[PDB]
Design a protein around this ligand. Structure first.
Ligand SMILES: Cc1cccc(-c2cc(Nc3ccn(C)n3)nc3[nH]cc(C#N)c23)c1
Length: 261
């Protein structure tokens, strides 16, 4: 059919880590997608990981086109925007909405980890919503392979966003990839339930992080959180990554399995 390969760039959806994201509409079909435009090693890695992704809670990759210097990465659009924009400052969101998003985030993260990929920058800006409020993990710029031929490799590069980063990445030379992603899902959950981040970074000099280690849950944000989701947070936000809860065990948690509105 003539013209089915042409896309109109309609509006900017934002600037991400590397380059702008635009809404693109097919001239023939009217299909609406997102395109990441990059004016170009790093991005050969991203494309490679992006082509692996096939899951309902992960942004799908439709292909790429190079036009001289510029690369165009075509991806599933999430017409509902970001989870960041559903979180009300100082309030968060209703507990049942947060639970459903949490279930969907774990499903995506289980998937990634099962194909041996770690995302490394989980936060509400990178968690996108489709038309039915289904959550999708987006942005694979920092993602990397942590398991290959059934052998794990330890990570050593420090990246992410400080309020979301696990404390081992500030303290240790090398660390396991999976508990880092788990930890960040815990900060996300805290943000959904309280509408605020518990600390600037999880270090020994941050008084809010010390308070948490001393169990001062009569302070904010913890005071705003019901005891059941808080008991789960107590198992996620554990400083020793070897003692931190894993995802199979999160799936057995009582709040995780609680029926809610
Ligand atoms: C990480 C990031 C940064 C900027 C834009 C996007 C982004 C925003 C979006 N939908 C919408 C709908 C409405 N707004 C504002 N945004 N859909 C997407 N699908 C893949 C994306 C990617 N990367 C992406 C993602």
């Amino acid at each position: 059919v003539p013209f089915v390969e042409d896309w109109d760039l309609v509006q900017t959806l934002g600037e991400g880590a590397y380059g702008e994201v635009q809404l693109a509409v097919n001239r023939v079909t009217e299909e609406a997608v997102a395109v990441k435009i990059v004016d170009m090693e790093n991005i050969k890695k991203e494309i490679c990981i992006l082509k692996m992704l096939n899951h309902e809670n992960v942004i799908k990759f439709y292909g790429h086109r190079r036009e001289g210097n510029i690369q165009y990465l075509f991806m599933e659009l999430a017409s509902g925007g970001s989870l960041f924009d559903r979180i009300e400052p100082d309030i968060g969101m209703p507990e049942p909405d947060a639970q459903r998003f949490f279930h969907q985030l774990m499903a995506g993260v289980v998937y990634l980890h099962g194909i041996g990929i770690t995302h490394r920058d989980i936060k509400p800006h990178n968690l996108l919503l489709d038309e039915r409020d289904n959550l999708k993990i987006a942005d694979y710029s920092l993602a990397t392979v942590f398991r290959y031929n059934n052998r794990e490799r330890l990570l050593n590069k420090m990246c992410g966003t400080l309020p979301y980063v696990a404390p081992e990445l500030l303290k240790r030379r090398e660390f396991h990839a999976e508990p880092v992603d788990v930890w960040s899902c815990g900060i996300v959950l805290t943000a959904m339930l309280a509408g605020e981040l518990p600390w600037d970074q999880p270090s020994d000099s941050c008084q809010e992080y010390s308070d948490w280690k001393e169990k001062k849950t009569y302070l904010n944000p913890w005071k705003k959180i019901d005891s059941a989701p808080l008991a789960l947070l107590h198992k996620i936000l554990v400083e020793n990554p070897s003692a931190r809860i894993t995802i199979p065990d999160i799936k057995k948690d009582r709040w995780y399995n609680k029926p809610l509105k």
